[PDB]
Amino acid sequence: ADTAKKTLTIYSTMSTDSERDTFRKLAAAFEKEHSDIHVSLHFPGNDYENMMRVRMAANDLPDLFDTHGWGKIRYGEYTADLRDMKWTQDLDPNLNSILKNKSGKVYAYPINQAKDGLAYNRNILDRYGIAPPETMDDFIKALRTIKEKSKGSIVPFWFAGYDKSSFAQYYDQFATPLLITDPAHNEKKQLINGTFQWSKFTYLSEILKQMQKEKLINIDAVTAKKSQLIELMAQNKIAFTMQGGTLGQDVAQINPNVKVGIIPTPAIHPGDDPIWIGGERYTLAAWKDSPQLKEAKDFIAFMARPANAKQMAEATSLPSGLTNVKADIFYANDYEYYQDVKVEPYFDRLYLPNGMWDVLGTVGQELAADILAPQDISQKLGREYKRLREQSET
Ligand SMILES: [Cl-]
Ligand SMILES: [Cl-]
Ligand SMILES: [Cl-]
Ligand SMILES: [Cl-]
Ligand SMILES: [Cl-]
């Protein structure tokens, strides 16, 4: 260590080599402009939550940290208000409800943003005359069409069911149109206050069971692995799958003749609009009590400069959080086509106690394996919801 420098500690949930390497390159560029700062960048991976929990309890936070979809709920008491920073004038308005309170606090700087729906093979849908589905009913009808017309040669909706998170993603994304987006058919208040009736969730298990029974998902869903997806998609073997984020670009590298697109998550209730799911992905929040708060803010401002924000966003394959930055990403075409579609945060992060992600994955895998029936799943979910609320409380 150089004792003529002070250390600025930054925690990140970034996972890929492109993300980590680009963040390090930008940290090095920051250091060129600030000869007295050594940036200490940490990527704790699976240990992130445990380490931040202990650091919060110790009142010993990193100077900058990633809130990764939990900005208000988990980090509200520790974050510096960023409302007086210059970059806030360009915050994507789709992020206002997620990264601000109505009373004006800006909780964190969004490096990027997540917008998840369904990924699909454009050519397959054109072969069979299928328009992008905007409702669950139209989605299922498309799956039936693909099964009928392909005579079983194309998987209509593919799951890597070996990994329970594949089913969790299904439940989590579709819980938003089911329970959140429609003012006449939502349960926001009941979810937050513990009175939610899990009988209202059964619909999603019924749909999944319909897809299984009707051979609209892959026959091998219980044993299919994430590592198989790119090759199968590039071989024109899959019509739809839940969005993973880099599928199109990865497939194009192997077979440029296959064009993968994305669409928003279909709506469920009549008259409701399709929705993008995500919002926060990676953020930089400053610890309000950091002795190096000024430097932390200088680093955020540096990251928010358009050339830097574009670079970082592109490494993550997602749009920037700022309107003055147009990251050249693979799905940019589709995000422009769907520019007026709204964004909802991930259901589990806002509406369920911590721990429910794994439970959603569990029950979906047990459904696919014919261990649990839809009615019994909702009862298990309710029990875990109650238990995990009781534990997060006490
Ligand atoms: Cl965390
Ligand atoms: Cl897997
Ligand atoms: Cl994707
Ligand atoms: Cl962008
Ligand atoms: Cl979990």
Coordinates of C-alpha atoms and ligand atoms in Angstrom, one line a residue:
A1 CA 0.0 0.0 0.0
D2 CA 0.9 3.6 -0.8
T3 CA 0.3 5.6 2.4
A4 CA 0.0 8.8 0.4
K5 CA -3.3 7.5 -0.9
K6 CA -6.7 6.9 0.9
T7 CA -8.7 3.8 0.1
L8 CA -12.3 4.2 -1.4
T9 CA -14.1 0.9 -0.8
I10 CA -16.7 -0.2 -3.3
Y11 CA -18.9 -3.3 -3.1
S12 CA -20.5 -4.7 -6.2
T13 CA -22.9 -7.7 -7.2
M14 CA -21.5 -7.8 -10.7
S15 CA -20.8 -11.3 -11.9
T16 CA -19.3 -11.5 -15.4
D17 CA -15.8 -10.9 -16.5
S18 CA -16.9 -8.1 -18.8
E19 CA -18.6 -6.3 -15.9
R20 CA -15.8 -6.8 -13.4
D21 CA -13.0 -5.9 -15.9
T22 CA -14.8 -2.8 -17.2
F23 CA -15.5 -1.6 -13.6
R24 CA -11.8 -2.1 -12.8
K25 CA -10.8 -0.2 -15.9
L26 CA -13.1 2.7 -15.0
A27 CA -11.7 2.7 -11.4
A28 CA -8.2 2.9 -12.8
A29 CA -9.3 5.9 -15.0
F30 CA -10.7 7.5 -11.9
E31 CA -7.4 7.0 -10.1
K32 CA -5.6 8.9 -12.9
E33 CA -7.8 12.0 -12.1
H34 CA -7.4 11.4 -8.3
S35 CA -3.7 10.7 -7.4
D36 CA -4.6 10.4 -3.7
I37 CA -7.3 7.6 -4.1
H38 CA -6.8 3.9 -4.2
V39 CA -10.1 2.3 -5.3
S40 CA -10.7 -1.0 -3.5
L41 CA -13.3 -2.9 -5.6
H42 CA -14.9 -6.0 -4.1
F43 CA -17.0 -8.5 -5.9
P44 CA -18.1 -10.8 -3.0
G45 CA -20.4 -13.0 -5.2
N46 CA -22.6 -15.4 -3.2
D47 CA -21.2 -13.9 0.1
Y48 CA -22.5 -10.4 -0.7
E49 CA -25.7 -10.5 1.3
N50 CA -24.0 -12.1 4.4
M51 CA -21.1 -9.6 4.3
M52 CA -23.4 -6.6 4.0
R53 CA -25.7 -7.8 6.7
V54 CA -22.7 -8.0 9.1
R55 CA -21.4 -4.6 7.9
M56 CA -24.8 -3.0 8.4
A57 CA -25.0 -4.5 11.9
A58 CA -21.5 -3.1 12.6
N59 CA -22.4 0.3 11.2
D60 CA -19.3 -0.3 9.1
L61 CA -20.4 -0.1 5.5
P62 CA -18.2 0.2 2.4
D63 CA -18.0 3.8 1.1
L64 CA -20.0 2.7 -1.9
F65 CA -22.2 -0.4 -2.3
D66 CA -24.6 -2.0 -4.6
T67 CA -28.3 -2.1 -3.5
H68 CA -29.2 -4.6 -6.3
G69 CA -33.0 -4.2 -6.1
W70 CA -33.3 -3.7 -2.4
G71 CA -32.4 0.1 -2.1
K72 CA -35.4 1.2 -0.1
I73 CA -36.3 -1.9 1.9
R74 CA -32.9 -3.0 3.0
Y75 CA -30.7 0.0 2.7
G76 CA -33.0 3.0 3.3
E77 CA -31.4 3.8 6.7
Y78 CA -27.8 3.8 5.4
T79 CA -27.9 5.5 2.0
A80 CA -26.8 9.1 1.4
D81 CA -29.5 11.1 -0.4
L82 CA -28.2 11.9 -3.9
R83 CA -30.9 14.3 -4.9
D84 CA -28.5 17.3 -5.1
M85 CA -26.2 15.5 -7.6
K86 CA -26.1 16.8 -11.2
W87 CA -26.8 13.4 -12.8
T88 CA -30.2 13.2 -11.3
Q89 CA -31.7 15.4 -14.0
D90 CA -31.2 12.6 -16.4
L91 CA -32.5 9.7 -14.3
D92 CA -34.7 7.4 -16.5
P93 CA -38.2 8.2 -15.4
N94 CA -39.0 4.4 -15.4
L95 CA -36.8 4.3 -12.4
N96 CA -38.5 7.1 -10.3
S97 CA -40.6 4.8 -8.2
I98 CA -37.8 2.5 -7.5
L99 CA -34.8 4.8 -6.8
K100 CA -36.6 7.7 -5.3
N101 CA -39.2 8.4 -2.7
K102 CA -42.1 10.7 -3.5
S103 CA -40.7 13.2 -0.8
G104 CA -37.6 13.5 -3.0
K105 CA -34.8 11.3 -1.7
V106 CA -32.6 9.7 -4.5
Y107 CA -31.3 6.5 -2.8
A108 CA -28.6 5.3 -5.3
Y109 CA -27.1 5.8 -8.8
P110 CA -28.3 3.3 -11.3
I111 CA -25.4 2.0 -13.4
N112 CA -27.9 0.2 -15.6
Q113 CA -31.4 -1.1 -15.5
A114 CA -33.1 -4.4 -16.0
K115 CA -36.1 -4.9 -18.3
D116 CA -37.2 -8.5 -18.5
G117 CA -40.0 -10.2 -20.4
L118 CA -39.7 -13.2 -22.8
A119 CA -36.9 -14.0 -25.3
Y120 CA -38.0 -15.6 -28.6
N121 CA -36.9 -16.8 -32.0
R122 CA -38.1 -14.2 -34.5
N123 CA -37.9 -16.5 -37.5
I124 CA -39.9 -19.2 -35.8
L125 CA -42.8 -16.9 -35.0
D126 CA -42.7 -15.5 -38.6
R127 CA -42.8 -19.1 -40.0
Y128 CA -46.0 -19.8 -38.1
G129 CA -47.7 -16.4 -38.5
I130 CA -47.5 -15.6 -34.8
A131 CA -47.6 -12.0 -33.6
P132 CA -45.8 -11.2 -30.3
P133 CA -48.2 -12.2 -27.5
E134 CA -49.4 -9.4 -25.2
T135 CA -51.5 -11.6 -22.8
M136 CA -51.1 -14.9 -21.1
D137 CA -53.9 -16.4 -23.1
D138 CA -52.4 -15.2 -26.4
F139 CA -49.0 -16.6 -25.2
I140 CA -50.4 -20.0 -24.4
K141 CA -52.3 -20.0 -27.8
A142 CA -48.9 -19.3 -29.5
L143 CA -47.3 -22.2 -27.7
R144 CA -50.1 -24.5 -28.8
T145 CA -49.6 -23.2 -32.4
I146 CA -45.9 -23.9 -32.3
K147 CA -46.5 -27.4 -31.0
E148 CA -49.2 -28.1 -33.7
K149 CA -47.3 -26.7 -36.6
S150 CA -43.8 -27.9 -35.7
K151 CA -45.2 -31.3 -35.0
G152 CA -43.2 -31.4 -31.9
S153 CA -39.8 -30.4 -33.5
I154 CA -39.7 -27.1 -31.7
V155 CA -39.9 -26.6 -27.9
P156 CA -42.6 -23.9 -27.5
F157 CA -41.4 -22.6 -24.1
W158 CA -38.1 -23.9 -22.7
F159 CA -36.9 -24.3 -19.1
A160 CA -33.6 -25.2 -17.7
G161 CA -35.5 -26.9 -14.9
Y162 CA -32.4 -28.6 -13.4
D163 CA -31.8 -25.2 -11.8
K164 CA -34.7 -24.3 -9.6
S165 CA -34.2 -20.5 -10.3
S166 CA -35.6 -21.2 -13.8
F167 CA -39.0 -21.8 -12.3
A168 CA -38.6 -19.0 -9.7
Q169 CA -38.1 -16.6 -12.6
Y170 CA -41.4 -17.7 -14.1
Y171 CA -43.3 -17.2 -10.9
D172 CA -41.6 -14.0 -10.0
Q173 CA -42.1 -12.3 -13.3
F174 CA -45.7 -13.3 -13.8
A175 CA -46.7 -12.5 -10.2
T176 CA -46.4 -8.8 -11.2
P177 CA -49.2 -8.8 -13.9
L178 CA -51.2 -11.2 -11.7
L179 CA -51.1 -9.3 -8.5
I180 CA -49.6 -5.8 -8.9
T181 CA -50.1 -3.9 -12.2
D182 CA -53.9 -3.8 -12.5
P183 CA -55.4 -1.3 -10.1
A184 CA -58.7 -3.2 -10.1
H185 CA -57.0 -6.6 -9.5
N186 CA -54.1 -6.1 -7.2
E187 CA -52.9 -7.1 -3.8
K188 CA -50.1 -4.7 -3.0
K189 CA -51.4 -3.7 0.4
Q190 CA -52.2 -7.3 1.4
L191 CA -48.9 -8.6 0.4
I192 CA -47.1 -5.9 2.4
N193 CA -49.2 -6.3 5.5
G194 CA -49.3 -10.2 5.7
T195 CA -53.0 -10.7 4.9
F196 CA -52.4 -11.9 1.3
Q197 CA -54.4 -15.0 0.4
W198 CA -52.2 -17.5 -1.5
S199 CA -55.2 -18.9 -3.2
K200 CA -54.8 -16.0 -5.5
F201 CA -51.4 -17.3 -6.6
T202 CA -52.7 -20.7 -7.7
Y203 CA -53.3 -19.5 -11.1
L204 CA -49.6 -19.5 -11.9
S205 CA -49.2 -23.0 -10.8
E206 CA -52.2 -24.1 -12.9
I207 CA -50.7 -22.4 -16.0
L208 CA -47.4 -24.1 -15.5
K209 CA -49.1 -27.5 -15.0
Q210 CA -51.1 -26.8 -18.2
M211 CA -48.0 -26.1 -20.1
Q212 CA -46.4 -29.3 -18.8
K213 CA -49.4 -31.6 -19.5
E214 CA -50.0 -30.1 -23.0
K215 CA -46.3 -30.5 -23.9
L216 CA -45.8 -26.7 -24.3
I217 CA -42.6 -26.9 -22.3
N218 CA -39.7 -29.2 -22.9
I219 CA -40.3 -32.8 -21.9
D220 CA -36.9 -32.8 -20.1
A221 CA -37.6 -29.7 -18.1
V222 CA -36.7 -31.4 -14.8
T223 CA -33.2 -32.3 -16.1
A224 CA -32.4 -29.5 -18.6
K225 CA -29.4 -27.4 -17.8
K226 CA -28.7 -23.7 -18.3
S227 CA -25.6 -24.7 -20.3
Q228 CA -27.8 -26.2 -23.0
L229 CA -29.8 -23.1 -23.9
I230 CA -27.5 -21.2 -26.3
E231 CA -26.8 -24.3 -28.5
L232 CA -30.5 -25.2 -28.6
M233 CA -31.7 -21.7 -29.4
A234 CA -29.0 -21.4 -32.1
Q235 CA -30.3 -24.6 -33.7
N236 CA -33.9 -23.3 -34.0
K237 CA -35.1 -25.7 -31.4
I238 CA -36.7 -23.3 -29.0
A239 CA -39.5 -20.7 -29.7
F240 CA -39.7 -18.8 -26.3
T241 CA -37.8 -18.8 -23.0
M242 CA -37.6 -16.5 -20.0
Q243 CA -35.3 -13.7 -20.5
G244 CA -31.7 -14.2 -19.4
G245 CA -30.2 -11.0 -20.9
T246 CA -27.4 -12.1 -23.3
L247 CA -29.1 -14.9 -25.2
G248 CA -29.5 -13.0 -28.5
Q249 CA -25.9 -11.9 -28.6
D250 CA -24.6 -15.3 -27.6
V251 CA -26.7 -17.1 -30.2
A252 CA -25.6 -14.6 -32.9
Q253 CA -22.0 -15.5 -32.3
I254 CA -22.7 -19.2 -33.0
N255 CA -25.4 -18.9 -35.7
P256 CA -25.9 -15.4 -37.1
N257 CA -28.9 -16.6 -39.0
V258 CA -30.9 -16.9 -35.8
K259 CA -32.3 -13.6 -34.5
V260 CA -33.5 -13.6 -30.9
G261 CA -35.8 -10.8 -29.8
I262 CA -37.4 -9.8 -26.5
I263 CA -40.9 -8.7 -25.6
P264 CA -42.4 -7.4 -22.3
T265 CA -44.0 -9.8 -19.8
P266 CA -47.5 -10.5 -21.0
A267 CA -50.4 -9.1 -19.1
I268 CA -52.9 -11.4 -17.3
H269 CA -56.0 -9.3 -16.5
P270 CA -58.2 -7.9 -19.2
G271 CA -57.3 -4.4 -20.4
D272 CA -54.0 -4.4 -18.6
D273 CA -50.7 -3.7 -20.5
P274 CA -47.6 -5.9 -20.8
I275 CA -44.8 -4.9 -18.4
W276 CA -41.0 -4.9 -18.2
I277 CA -39.7 -6.5 -15.0
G278 CA -36.6 -5.4 -13.2
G279 CA -35.7 -1.8 -12.6
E280 CA -32.6 -1.7 -10.4
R281 CA -29.9 -4.0 -11.5
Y282 CA -26.5 -2.6 -10.4
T283 CA -26.3 0.6 -8.3
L284 CA -23.8 2.7 -6.5
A285 CA -25.2 3.9 -3.2
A286 CA -23.0 6.0 -0.8
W287 CA -22.9 5.3 2.9
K288 CA -24.3 8.4 4.6
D289 CA -21.8 8.1 7.4
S290 CA -18.7 7.4 5.3
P291 CA -15.7 9.4 6.3
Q292 CA -15.0 9.5 2.5
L293 CA -18.6 10.5 1.4
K294 CA -17.2 13.4 -0.7
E295 CA -14.9 11.0 -2.6
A296 CA -17.8 8.5 -2.9
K297 CA -19.9 11.2 -4.6
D298 CA -17.0 12.2 -6.8
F299 CA -16.8 8.6 -7.9
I300 CA -20.5 8.4 -8.7
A301 CA -20.3 11.7 -10.7
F302 CA -17.4 10.2 -12.6
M303 CA -19.3 7.0 -13.4
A304 CA -22.3 9.2 -14.6
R305 CA -20.3 11.0 -17.2
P306 CA -21.8 9.8 -20.5
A307 CA -18.8 8.1 -22.0
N308 CA -18.2 6.2 -18.8
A309 CA -21.9 5.4 -18.3
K310 CA -22.1 4.1 -21.8
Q311 CA -19.0 1.9 -21.4
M312 CA -20.1 0.4 -18.1
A313 CA -23.7 -0.2 -19.3
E314 CA -22.4 -2.0 -22.5
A315 CA -20.3 -4.3 -20.4
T316 CA -23.5 -5.3 -18.5
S317 CA -25.5 -5.8 -21.8
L318 CA -28.2 -3.5 -20.4
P319 CA -29.3 0.1 -20.8
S320 CA -27.9 2.9 -18.7
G321 CA -29.9 4.4 -16.0
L322 CA -29.6 7.8 -17.6
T323 CA -31.6 9.2 -20.5
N324 CA -28.6 11.1 -22.0
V325 CA -26.8 7.8 -22.6
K326 CA -27.6 5.4 -25.3
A327 CA -25.7 2.2 -24.7
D328 CA -25.2 0.1 -27.9
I329 CA -26.5 -3.1 -26.7
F330 CA -27.9 -6.1 -28.5
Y331 CA -31.6 -5.6 -27.5
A332 CA -31.5 -1.8 -28.1
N333 CA -33.9 -2.2 -31.1
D334 CA -36.5 -4.0 -29.0
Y335 CA -36.3 -1.6 -26.1
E336 CA -37.0 1.3 -28.6
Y337 CA -39.9 -0.6 -30.1
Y338 CA -41.3 -1.0 -26.5
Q339 CA -40.2 2.5 -25.3
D340 CA -43.6 3.3 -23.8
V341 CA -43.9 0.0 -21.8
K342 CA -43.6 0.6 -18.1
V343 CA -41.2 -1.0 -15.6
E344 CA -42.1 -2.8 -12.4
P345 CA -39.6 -4.0 -9.8
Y346 CA -39.1 -7.7 -9.2
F347 CA -42.1 -8.9 -7.3
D348 CA -40.1 -10.9 -4.7
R349 CA -37.9 -8.0 -3.8
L350 CA -40.7 -5.6 -3.0
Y351 CA -43.6 -7.8 -1.9
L352 CA -42.2 -11.0 -0.3
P353 CA -40.0 -11.6 2.7
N354 CA -36.4 -12.4 2.0
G355 CA -36.0 -16.1 1.3
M356 CA -39.1 -16.5 -0.9
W357 CA -37.1 -16.7 -4.2
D358 CA -35.7 -20.1 -3.3
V359 CA -39.2 -21.3 -2.2
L360 CA -40.7 -20.2 -5.6
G361 CA -38.0 -22.2 -7.3
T362 CA -38.6 -25.2 -5.0
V363 CA -42.3 -25.4 -5.6
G364 CA -41.9 -25.0 -9.3
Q365 CA -39.4 -27.8 -9.5
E366 CA -41.6 -30.0 -7.4
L367 CA -44.5 -29.2 -9.7
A368 CA -42.5 -30.1 -12.8
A369 CA -41.3 -33.3 -11.2
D370 CA -45.0 -34.3 -10.4
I371 CA -44.3 -34.2 -6.6
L372 CA -46.7 -31.4 -5.8
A373 CA -50.1 -30.4 -7.3
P374 CA -51.1 -26.7 -7.9
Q375 CA -53.5 -26.5 -4.9
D376 CA -50.9 -27.9 -2.5
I377 CA -48.3 -25.4 -3.7
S378 CA -50.2 -22.4 -2.7
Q379 CA -50.6 -23.8 0.8
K380 CA -46.9 -24.3 1.1
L381 CA -46.2 -20.8 -0.2
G382 CA -48.5 -19.3 2.4
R383 CA -46.7 -21.2 5.2
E384 CA -43.3 -20.1 4.1
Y385 CA -44.4 -16.5 3.6
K386 CA -45.8 -16.5 7.2
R387 CA -42.6 -18.2 8.6
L388 CA -40.2 -15.9 6.8
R389 CA -42.1 -12.8 7.8
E390 CA -42.1 -14.0 11.4
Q391 CA -38.3 -14.6 11.2
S392 CA -37.4 -11.3 9.3
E393 CA -39.5 -9.6 12.0
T394 CA -38.0 -11.5 15.0
Ligands
CL1 CL -27.5 -7.2 0.3
CL2 CL -28.2 -25.7 -14.7
CL3 CL -32.1 -12.9 -23.1
CL4 CL -28.8 3.3 -22.5
CL5 CL -34.0 -16.9 -1.6

